[PDB]
Amino acid sequence: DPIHDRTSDYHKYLKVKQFKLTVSDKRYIWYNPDPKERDSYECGEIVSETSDSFTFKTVDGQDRQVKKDDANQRNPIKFDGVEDMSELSYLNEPAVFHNLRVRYNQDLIYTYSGLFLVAVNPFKRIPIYTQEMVDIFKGRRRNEVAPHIFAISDVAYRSMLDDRQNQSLLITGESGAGKTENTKKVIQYLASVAGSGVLEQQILQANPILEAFGNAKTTRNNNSSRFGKFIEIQFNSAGFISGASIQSYLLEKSRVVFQSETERNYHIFYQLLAGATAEEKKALHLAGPESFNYLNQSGCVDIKGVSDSEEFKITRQAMDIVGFSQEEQMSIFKIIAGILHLGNIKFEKGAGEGAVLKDKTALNAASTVFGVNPSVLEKALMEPRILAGRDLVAQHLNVEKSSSSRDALVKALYGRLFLWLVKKINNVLCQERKAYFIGVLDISGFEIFKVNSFEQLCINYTNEKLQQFFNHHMFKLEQEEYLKEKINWTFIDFGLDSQATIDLIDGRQPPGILALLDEQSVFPNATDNTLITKLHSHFSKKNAKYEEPRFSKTEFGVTHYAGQVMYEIQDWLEKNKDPLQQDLELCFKDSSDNVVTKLFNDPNIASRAKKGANFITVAAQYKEQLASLMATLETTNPHFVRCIIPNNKQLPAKLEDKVVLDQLRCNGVLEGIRITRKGFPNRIIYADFVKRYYLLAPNVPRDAEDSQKATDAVLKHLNIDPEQYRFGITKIFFRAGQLARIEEAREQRISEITRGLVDQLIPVINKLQDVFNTLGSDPLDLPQIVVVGSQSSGKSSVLENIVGRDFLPRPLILQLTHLPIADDGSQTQEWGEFLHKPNDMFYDFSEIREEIIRDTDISAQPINLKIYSPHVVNLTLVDLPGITDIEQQIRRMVMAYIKKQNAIIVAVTPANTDLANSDALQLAKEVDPEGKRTIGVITKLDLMDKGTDAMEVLTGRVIPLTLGFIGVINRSQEDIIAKKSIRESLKSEILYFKNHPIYKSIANRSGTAYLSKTLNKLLMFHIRDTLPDLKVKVSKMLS
């Protein structure tokens, strides 16, 4: 399984490479050392914070302060390279960019951002698109695998099948950002998982055909799409590919006759001249690109790394696969060559005003490959006949007009040829009946150049609709979640903000730009000036999205979603009408070539108005085509892929701050995470919230049964403002920022209780004990001292002796803290504290005995008693019930305690009860065979017998132990009856051992004083010894 194998290409090319921050409490923030350079950011460490402001040290070396509102906090370095950025506490611009940068530098181009898939063009080849890679993502769910265009393709596929609903993938981005490469990957994936099959190959081979005729090298992309497309992959009810259909939009026909410096014409022109066979060159009258006007003006005829001859063979192969016949293929090449020959026709000024054609070479070459009459073609170009009432009069045209008519014929032939290719492909691939489909939209994003004409308005208008579509989708998803979870919050439709710009463009009443253009396009003597004049007359200072420039008399502004765009009105009338002399239509309708003739006869191709319809302008046609695409998209469940270009030099490993950030700002990527920042952007299933923040509140099990009640407990203890959150049916909902503040509390808390893990070790362990061992569990295997003895062993007296005062009547965690002599030199009064009584102080030890009895009315939940006294040593002990229905759980509890090797066992045993067949030591040796962590305490020594001595065990012989034995004596029953108090009877204990015939030799290693000192010592060093392992355990359970 490659997904788990680290030594697999999957982990190498799709997975990110590979306690310090745990104890650390450092905070960092993104800032720009130069306020005027918003795109350049640096990391600064936070040093202090007030009510609503931060203070940090800049790398330059200088404290700086910023408001908490404008602060761009940085996420913990642990999250650098996350697969899905939606799980970040901070999603500010610099933070987003940073995670993308981290991934990009590791050659990870794919990153998730909620319902957004981000892909940053690598401008390099990364082996993550092989079949094996396809197989790896098959079936896999998003969370189950790393980010990849294949993963989102699978999700859409699974959704189609599971919900029986059509899907769509919208791949958007700037020119060269990677839309088409990713579009091909989706198809590659779908053909594989739902598929080397005839139909499959045909679908796969259709793209190569359209790219040859619709792509070209521009200054921003060597393989630029000069048309947009919507590919529908069809499936049968069983989920197998059954067909495909293609729609093309806004083909850049003007490129056929003109290309700006360094750019090329459509690939097919160069492919034909370089890949045609010798026989084809002759039949077509071909020559090198330099001999053709339409190819020798840009200064570029080839692309580095690209072989046009090789690509030609590929295109021819693709046409064979899709099914174009040999003759159809030849006719397509004749059209391409004919267009080239038309471009070489040179019109000259005749004796008069009319143009003439002196050389007939180009005209004839064209006429021969087109299968039309040269004489008729020549007259149709320079002397088209126009209707003068009821007679046709030959209008002899000058040079400029003849040349323009030639170009119009060229564009019309290319445009029609392209539509014909698409229609032919659809005839072979499209099936009238299909159960479902997955549509992929590959079209240009907003276009804002210095010069913007009609084409740009169409594409911008398109993107206004697509952005509106996305916002509205987000709206619906949000509305659906709040409804399902029972969260009362209503948003204003996100898409309503695009309506104004859209109406200004395609509105009927009031009439928008297109309507006014159409009207003006059919107006008698209308000109580009009367047009601009009319637009200003309708929207200047009357529509907030429109702007009449201050000086320019040929432009107008439109405020688009992505910013204002200035449009030049020049040629708009001609563009909207796309005229072609009727005599040219007639000339080609009489062609001897089958395909040429279809380009002028097929109504669905030869014109915009279908058989029986009225006049249709280009604008009206495009508005109808766009509404049809939107209606289709609105019948699907949409998936969005955001492509980002790393720089403007088409170079690998060179992510530029300004270039990327600019896109993240208009791509909507930063919008798709700030659109709902007004409601409750964050929500977490209760059990998950509790599992993570239980640590911030007392008495809250990481796995409480009632997750919702626990969640409520945490928020209350943290004193969170009730308005900042809402309780859903399955999730807790938070206002923007609130969850991030709770996460920061968790981080600070973690640091507060783990930093000590690096003397006063006893207290540090005491803290962890109060935080994790209250419910009676020891998940961290805390190093502790456990006291074990019989109900009559008199162990409780031992504890009261160590405490130096009576206070004893569940496990009992006794945490003693020594109090130093007062600063003035006085003796501080001793008192106690219970963990379940947060604000109480027990100065009366009698009340402590009572509280123990109260809270107790056998259980595994320990009572946590803390005692602060200047008469005790620093020490922590865990007293367990002494050793039937009840005597079954007790032994169970004890065992569960001494079982751990991180525990030291204090076995208390009466001296007046032999040594063999003990009790505590028995259970002790059971879990501690080598007796390396057991210390025996011998009590009631003064209660043995006449000549009964115990020096044998005290010196460690009857039963050896690494830690040894310690003897002691306690108060008698009549002593308790009298005034005789503890730490008074201790004075006696010392004299007993000091003046004892045999024990006097070991007097210094006996008694309560010595026992307490020893336990403190054993605990200090045991904690120190266990410290390393405990750090590992703590790090784990906290992640």
Ligand SMILES: Nc1ncnc2c1ncn2[C@@H]1O[C@H](COP(=O)(O)OP(=O)(O)O)[C@@H](O)[C@H]1O
């Ligand atoms: N994921 C990718 N892997 C390799 N090269 C890529 C990738 N995405 C883009 N490219 C490179 O970028 C060029 C332009 O990408 P393209 O998809 O054609 O952009 P767009 O369609 O958005 O105009 C490609 O032809 C290729 O050289």
Ligand SMILES: OC[C@H]1O[C@@H](O)[C@H](O)[C@@H](O)[C@@H]1O
């Ligand atoms: O003009 C009526 C409608 O026509 C459709 O084609 C457009 O997409 C809508 O935006 C418009 O409101």
Ligand SMILES: [Mg+2]
């Ligand atoms: Mg493209």
